[PDB]
UniProtKB/Swiss-Prot annotation, chain A:
<feature type="short sequence motif" description="Cx9C motif 2">
    <location>
        <begin position="6"/>
        <end position="16"/>
    </location>
</feature>
<comment type="similarity">
    <text>Belongs to the mitochondrion-specific ribosomal protein mS37 family.</text>
</comment>
<protein>
    <recommendedName>
        <fullName>Small ribosomal subunit protein mS37</fullName>
    </recommendedName>
</protein>
<comment type="subunit">
    <text>Component of the mitochondrial small ribosomal subunit (mt-SSU). Mature mammalian 55S mitochondrial ribosomes consist of a small (28S) and a large (39S) subunit. The 28S small subunit contains a 12S ribosomal RNA (12S mt-rRNA) and 30 different proteins. The 39S large subunit contains a 16S rRNA (16S mt-rRNA), a copy of mitochondrial valine transfer RNA (mt-tRNA(Val)), which plays an integral structural role, and 52 different proteins.</text>
</comment>
Curated annotation (Swiss-Prot), chain B:
<comment type="similarity">
    <text>Belongs to the bacterial ribosomal protein bS1 family.</text>
</comment>
<dbReference type="GO" id="GO:0005763">
    <property type="term" value="C:mitochondrial small ribosomal subunit"/>
</dbReference>
<keyword id="KW-0689">Ribosomal protein</keyword>
<feature type="modified residue" description="N6-acetyllysine">
    <location>
        <position position="58"/>
    </location>
</feature>
<keyword id="KW-0687">Ribonucleoprotein</keyword>
<keyword id="KW-0007">Acetylation</keyword>
<protein>
    <recommendedName>
        <fullName>Small ribosomal subunit protein bS1m</fullName>
    </recommendedName>
</protein>
<keyword id="KW-1274">Primary mitochondrial disease</keyword>
<keyword id="KW-0225">Disease variant</keyword>
Amino acid sequence: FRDDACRKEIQGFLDCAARAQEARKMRSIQETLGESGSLLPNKLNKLLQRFPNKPYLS
Amino acid sequence: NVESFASMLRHSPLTQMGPAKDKLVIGRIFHIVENDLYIDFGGKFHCVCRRPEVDGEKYQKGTRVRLRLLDLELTSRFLGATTDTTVLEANAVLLGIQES
């Protein structure tokens, strides 16, 4: 447990943490704001409520 | 000797056209919202085709285009419904400008 002989290994673990931290921030915000692939329930339920299913007669 | 309605329907272009599936028709752009174009082609509903990238500028109101119709009215019935769901529009593919 000496930090003078394992300096190279620590940087790998350090630099990674920095990159990983940024990805978490980028992923959370971008997914909701960004429109990729499938829509979100909140926007998809506004589309299903415009064309409601009618299992009754009127 | 007044023409009846049964004679109009027999000799009308739509009736003789037959199934719209893969039929070349001529449309008229009547409303444009950004790239999307709203096109009438002698049917009950319009089609909403997107502006072609190659020559977008030429597609203004009045421009007459060529379409390859698929449906005259997009309908489908889904699980539990008692009637069909209609989006009040036709499906067609834009094939460019009618070069008169």
